[PDB]
Design an enzyme around this catalytic site. Structure first.
Site, PDB file in Angstrom:
ATOM      1  CB  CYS B  94     -22.603 -28.082  26.940  1.00  0.00           C
ATOM      2  SG  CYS B  94     -21.044 -27.864  26.056  1.00  0.00           S
ATOM      3  NE  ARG B 123     -11.441 -27.623  24.872  1.00  0.00           N
ATOM      4  CZ  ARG B 123     -12.605 -26.998  24.659  1.00  0.00           C
ATOM      5  NH1 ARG B 123     -13.379 -26.598  25.663  1.00  0.00           N
ATOM      6  NH2 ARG B 123     -13.009 -26.767  23.412  1.00  0.00           N
ATOM      7  CD  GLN B 141     -16.152 -22.404  25.165  1.00  0.00           C
ATOM      8  OE1 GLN B 141     -16.702 -23.122  26.002  1.00  0.00           O
ATOM      9  NE2 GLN B 141     -15.769 -22.857  23.975  1.00  0.00           N
ATOM     10  CG  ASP B 143     -19.923 -22.010  26.347  1.00  0.00           C
ATOM     11  OD1 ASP B 143     -20.614 -21.960  25.307  1.00  0.00           O
ATOM     12  OD2 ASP B 143     -19.598 -23.089  26.874  1.00  0.00           O
ATOM     13  CG  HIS B 145     -24.540 -24.221  26.007  1.00  0.00           C
ATOM     14  ND1 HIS B 145     -23.564 -23.944  26.938  1.00  0.00           N
ATOM     15  CD2 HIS B 145     -23.960 -25.015  25.078  1.00  0.00           C
ATOM     16  CE1 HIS B 145     -22.445 -24.553  26.593  1.00  0.00           C
ATOM     17  NE2 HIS B 145     -22.658 -25.215  25.471  1.00  0.00           N
ATOM     18  CE  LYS B 225     -17.594 -27.949  13.312  1.00  0.00           C
ATOM     19  NZ  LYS B 225     -16.184 -27.490  13.233  1.00  0.00           N
ATOM     20  CG  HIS B 271     -22.988 -26.546  21.899  1.00  0.00           C
ATOM     21  ND1 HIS B 271     -22.540 -27.054  23.098  1.00  0.00           N
ATOM     22  CD2 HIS B 271     -23.757 -27.512  21.347  1.00  0.00           C
ATOM     23  CE1 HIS B 271     -23.033 -28.266  23.274  1.00  0.00           C
ATOM     24  NE2 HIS B 271     -23.777 -28.567  22.225  1.00  0.00           N
TER      25      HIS B 271
HETATM   26  C1  LIG Z   1     -18.649 -27.767  23.659  1.00  0.00           C
HETATM   27  N1  LIG Z   1     -19.390 -26.668  23.034  1.00  0.00           N
HETATM   28  C2  LIG Z   1     -18.813 -25.411  22.519  1.00  0.00           C
HETATM   29  C3  LIG Z   1     -17.313 -25.506  22.247  1.00  0.00           C
HETATM   30  O1  LIG Z   1     -16.505 -25.435  23.171  1.00  0.00           O
HETATM   31  N2  LIG Z   1     -16.948 -25.670  20.973  1.00  0.00           N
HETATM   32  C4  LIG Z   1     -15.577 -25.477  20.515  1.00  0.00           C
HETATM   33  C5  LIG Z   1     -14.837 -26.756  20.264  1.00  0.00           C
HETATM   34  C6  LIG Z   1     -15.207 -27.963  20.652  1.00  0.00           C
HETATM   35  C7  LIG Z   1     -14.444 -29.213  20.376  1.00  0.00           C
HETATM   36  N3  LIG Z   1     -13.910 -29.814  21.612  1.00  0.00           N
HETATM   37  C8  LIG Z   1     -12.595 -29.625  21.954  1.00  0.00           C
HETATM   38  N4  LIG Z   1     -12.000 -30.101  22.988  1.00  0.00           N
HETATM   39  C9  LIG Z   1     -12.772 -30.897  23.837  1.00  0.00           C
HETATM   40  C10 LIG Z   1     -12.158 -31.460  24.960  1.00  0.00           C
HETATM   41  C11 LIG Z   1     -12.894 -32.264  25.815  1.00  0.00           C
HETATM   42 CL1  LIG Z   1     -12.087 -33.006  27.158  1.00  0.00          CL
HETATM   43  C12 LIG Z   1     -14.238 -32.516  25.562  1.00  0.00           C
HETATM   44 CL2  LIG Z   1     -15.187 -33.477  26.648  1.00  0.00          CL
HETATM   45  C13 LIG Z   1     -14.846 -31.991  24.438  1.00  0.00           C
HETATM   46  C14 LIG Z   1     -14.123 -31.163  23.585  1.00  0.00           C
HETATM   47  C15 LIG Z   1     -14.765 -30.580  22.397  1.00  0.00           C
HETATM   48  O2  LIG Z   1     -15.941 -30.715  22.106  1.00  0.00           O
HETATM   49  C16 LIG Z   1     -19.128 -24.214  23.427  1.00  0.00           C
HETATM   50  C17 LIG Z   1     -19.093 -22.899  22.678  1.00  0.00           C
HETATM   51  O3  LIG Z   1     -20.413 -24.393  24.026  1.00  0.00           O
HETATM   52 ZN   LIG Z   2     -21.196 -26.167  24.452  1.00  0.00          ZN
END
Ligand SMILES: CN[C@H](C(=O)NC/C=C/Cn1cnc2cc(Cl)c(Cl)cc2c1=O)[C@@H](C)O
Ligand SMILES: [Zn+2]
Ligand SMILES: CN[C@H](C(=O)NC/C=C/Cn1cnc2cc(Cl)c(Cl)cc2c1=O)[C@@H](C)O
Ligand SMILES: [Zn+2]
EC number: 6.1.1.3
Lengths: 400, 401
Positions: B94, B123, B141, B143, B145, B225, B271
């Site tokens: 994002c 992660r 992902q 992904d 936005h 969401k 997102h």
């Molecule tokens: C972050 N946005 C969306 C997404 O990934 N959502 C799924 C889950 C998100 C929850 N999630 C899970 N793990 C994370 C790990 C890190 Cl180190 C950070 Cl900085 C943020 C997240 C975080 O936000 C995508 C689809 O744009």
């Molecule tokens: Zn996102």
């Protein structure tokens, strides 16, 4: 005026910023160029009979110290940790390719095994020396590694050489300089091994009538290499291609195969990249063409445009026909003058501009005009789509 | 069997090692599946009018601290340093998409701006919680936005919802459970904003005639969401899809656009990911199909084979025709019995085995044998090629009859 930084901004291809030094943000149009270059490489991987793999981004430092590169390159490594274990972000794809090679039992029947990857590599270079797409930290190597016998080196180096010149001539690069790096002071293996290894590269070049200069001091500790340097239209040298023999890394990472005599042999490994870096090659291409990318590489290949609202339905139908034929096309139905429209897309370096007036709608034709300013006149719609398809699929440098 | 870790080794799709925990080594055949899945998603991105971008793998900690995710997720960050500066290996795409959005002055006319990416995320998860392709550290992902105005939210969530069911129906997943997560205790924004944002998600689901349920207080601090849980043929639940509204990040990262009233406006961010993770989804597909990947996904789609030595050149020509038709094809000209050839490629889950005997060569035909053991008879070569192409084009779950 052929700066890839300037053209990158004008055509909205990419950008870079201080929060990510030497690492590219690819925008829509630049990422399109990236992916078409990727598709071109894949067609050659298929022709020259390569597998395409994908290795992990990180790998344990314990494994990276086993490669033998740690002492020379620890300062150029990006390191990160998790659960009291240090991991390197990969600067090269070779160790990962050996890990895939080690899965399952290999024999001489499986060799030569050619394993390619568009490998995302990161190298911790000094930030002051970074500039544009030419010198970067994060890049994508059109990498491959050939696992083979000692008897197959000659033939596989020949095939690498053919693949280098074939791929360079696609982009109009005919002036190539070749350099063969010989045994260094460091080095592993015997003099008889280096005699044979250096001869394998030399004779392969000699048999293809390719002139080369020896590079005595230079050359890796694990084997000799051929390096290929192309020259752009400004006569600037670009060392892109490499073909590097390796009699070290396979043994050190426990790679082996069952030979014809049922003995365990360590395979010889050949490192090779042709474009060198995808980001770097795009930079060179952007400058070589000065934004006028050949139609197959161009982000937007055709723009179809009307004179008035009368032709809007015809332009939309023609746009769909071009999209159905696999052409990247947009419709320009704005309330602007035809000279204004043509100029905007001539500045954007859109190969073809398909003008549609009442003359063209009633006739089943289209008035084709190139970004170079060549008016091709009113042509049959099916004839135009056919010639654009041939130009794109043949990957021709030249327009109609 | 329906174990993806077992099947992955048997069909030589991938492997995993302790040197790179939770990070996949894609072999030729597994990476072929990955890339066709990528091509499929790409055709949806084109259809639903998405841009596709590529962001860098790491970015300065200083920028990541401004996102407002840092304090909650810093434990899950991979971190690396260079020249007295700390960089995070990106866990999400994002902020990078906002950096691309921030290049050039944006107008209301540019919205809705839909920016997709096959984003390689990392992660830092515990190693004890890792398990095959489903639970991983490194993943890609699907992904995107969407940058849009407040008034455009309903139509964009409506489009996202349609794209989710469209893509799930391709793989044979019709049973979807939908969950709308409402306002948590700790949150930004007024209650009036949360009333509209939650209502926008609910109306979009009502507009698509989708029954859902609430998950009370489970929303993120920056907005509500929708989450989509698909059910495989064994009736096992897999939460893959997500559509998450965001009223925080654009403002935090200085994202703006010039409105129709000539005022500086902050865009709303949606997102969304549909498959969730490319690695995870392939793992789910492997168990859904039990290795019998639909012809469009199959690593090797056709194997052409000869009964005796007599048909070797006919096989070579036929293999070349299938090659020219864009079909992933191999020739099995080994000195083996026809049953031996069929049993091996039936075990490797090759959709079609094109068998060539004397009677097939003489008539200009081929005997089509499926991996399910069925006999489709001797058909004309140009007919079969056109039918295989149509099965691949349409991404059909069903084989020929
Ligand atoms: C972050 N946005 C969306 C997404 O990934 N959502 C799924 C889950 C998100 C929850 N999630 C899970 N793990 C994370 C790990 C890190 Cl180190 C950070 Cl900085 C943020 C997240 C975080 O936000 C995508 C689809 O744009
Ligand atoms: Zn996102
Ligand atoms: C060694 N792999 C090959 C390659 O990249 N060759 C080009 C030049 C490589 C030299 N080179 C340059 N920088 C490096 C940085 C690091 Cl942190 C490491 Cl561990 C190795 C290298 C390294 O070997 C490809 C072609 O497979
Ligand atoms: Zn290498």
């Amino acid at each position: 005026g052929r700066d890839h930084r300037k053209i990158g901004k004008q055509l909205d291809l990419y950008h870079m910023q201080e929060e990510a030094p030497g690492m590219v943000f690819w925008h829509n149009d630049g990422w399109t160029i990236f992916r078409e270059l990727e598709v071109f490489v894949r067609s050659k991987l298929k022709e020259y009979q390569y597998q395409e793999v994908k290795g992990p981004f990180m790998m344990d430092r314990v494994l990276w110290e086993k490669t033998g590169h740690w002492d020379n390159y620890k300062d150029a490594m990006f390191t990160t940790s998790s659960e009291n274990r240090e991991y390197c972000i990969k600067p090269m794809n070779c160790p990962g390719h050996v890990q895939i090679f080690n899965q399952g039992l290999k024999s001489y029947r499986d060799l030569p095994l050619r394993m390619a990857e568009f490998g995302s590599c990161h190298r911790n270079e000094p930030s002051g020396a970074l500039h544009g797409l030419m010198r970067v930290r994060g890049f994508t190597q059109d990498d491959a590694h050939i696992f083979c016998t000692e008897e197959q080196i000659r033939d596989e180096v020949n095939a690498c050489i053919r693949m280098v010149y074939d791929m360079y001539s696609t982009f109009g690069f005919e002036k190539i300089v070749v350099k063969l790096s010989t045994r260094p002071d460091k080095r592993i293996g015997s003099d008889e091994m280096w005699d044979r290894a250096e001869a394998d590269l030399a004779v392969a070049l000699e048999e293809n009538n390719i002139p080369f200069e020896y590079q005595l001091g230079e050359g890796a500790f694990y084997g000799p290499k051929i390096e290929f340097t192309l020259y752009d239209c400004l006569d600037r040298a670009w060392q892109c291609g490499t073909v590097q023999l390796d009699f070290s890394l396979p043994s050190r990472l426990s790679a082996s195969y069952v030979g014809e005599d049922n003995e365990r042999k360590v395979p010889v490994m050949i490192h090779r990249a042709i474009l060198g870096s995808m980001e770097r090659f795009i930079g060179i291409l952007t400058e070589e063409f000065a934004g006028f990318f050949p139609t197959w590489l161009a982000p937007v290949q055709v723009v179809v445009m009307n004179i008035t609202d009368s032709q809007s339905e015809y332009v939309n139908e023609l746009t769909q026909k071009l999209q159905n034929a696999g052409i990247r096309v947009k419709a320009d139905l704005r309330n602007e003058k035809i000279g204004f429209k043509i100029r905007e897309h001539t500045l954007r370096r859109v190969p073809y501009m398909l003008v549609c007036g009442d003359k063209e709608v009633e006739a089943g034709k289209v008035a084709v005009r190139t970004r170079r300013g060549k008016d091709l006149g009113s042509l049959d719609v099916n004839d135009v789509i056919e010639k654009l398809q041939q130009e794109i699929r043949s990957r021709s440098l030249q327009q109609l």
